[PDB]
Subunit: 57 residues, 2 copies
């Protein structure tokens, strides 16, 4: 239903910003492999959020 | 330093469990494309956490 849909969109939005923050922390730490993986994680978090927005936005 | 490293590990652990929860919600909603993407997101969140654990664990 629309409230469950909105929970899921918000959580996708949230997760996308968390992964950006994690990217930033791993770059601040100069942890090169982990940063590269986190950067990919964030790109995928962004893909998920746009797709969830598209359907339930 | 070790406390910054531990912040980053915890946040990776957190993000991994959030993405599993998001996967579960999108499957509960029967939103097939978004679920497939979330499933991939979670696999990547798990890759990040293991790699961060490996380095800073």
């Amino acid at each position: 239903g629309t409230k469950q849909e909105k929970t899921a969109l918000n959580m996708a939005r949230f997760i996308r910003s968390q992964t950006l923050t994690l990217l930033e922390k791993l770059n601040e730490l100069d942890a090169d492999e982990q940063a590269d993986i986190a950067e990919s994680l964030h790109d995928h978090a962004d893909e998920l959020y746009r797709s969830v927005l598209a359907r339930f936005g």
